[PDB]
Amino acid sequence: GSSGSSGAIYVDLPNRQLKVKVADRRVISTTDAERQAVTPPGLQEAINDLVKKYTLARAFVRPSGTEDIVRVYAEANSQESADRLAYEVSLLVFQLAGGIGERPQPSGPSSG
């Protein structure tokens, strides 16, 4: 007889990504200038506060890059926090960067 084994990862924290098809650039007030502290000045803070107000949470965003759509991502120790934050962030942007298009949908507590 004989036996082997599988070597790989066995744990992948929860995470959630989104995409805000920004209508465009400029125009928006809180969407100009790029000096004095990494911009946008506040977002990082606002979210940060939310990232701190949460349990082991983490949110991020990626502007233009090989595309014309914004990238959103939020994770946490819990799936909910991961979703909540995510959904929120995406929204936070929708307004912050007056993001539009495909809007973020609510996870919705449903299990069976």
Does residue 104 form part of some domain? no
Instruction: Give the residue numbers of the binding site for substrate.
Output: 62-66, 71
Does residue 85 form part of some domain? yes
Radius of gyration of the chain (CA): 18
Q: Two tokens at 95?
A: 């307004």
* Domain with 88 in it: 14-98
Do 83 and 16 contact (CB within 8 A), yes or no? yes
Does residue 69 form part of some domain? yes
> Is it true that the peptide bond before 106 is cis, omega within 30 degrees of 0?
no
Q: How many residues does the chain have?
A: 112
Give the phi and the psi of residue 30 in degrees, each rounded to 5. Answer: -80, 55
Q: Which helix (H) or strand (E) holds 43?
A: helix 43-53
Does residue 76 form part of some domain? yes
Amino acid letter, 73: Y
Query: What is the greatest pairwise CA distance in the chain?
Result: 72
Q: Domain holding 86: CATH number?
A: 3.30.310.50
Work out how many domains the chain is built from and give that number: 1
Instruction: Give the residue numbers of the binding site.
Output: 62-66, 71
Backbone angle region of 39, left / alpha / beta, with phi > 0 → left and psi within -120 to 50 → alpha: beta
* DSSP per-residue letters across 50-111: HHHHSSSEEEEEE-SSSSSSEEEEEEESSHHHHHHHHHHHHHHHHHHT---SSPPPP-----
Does residue 3 form part of some domain? no
Does residue 1 form part of some domain? no
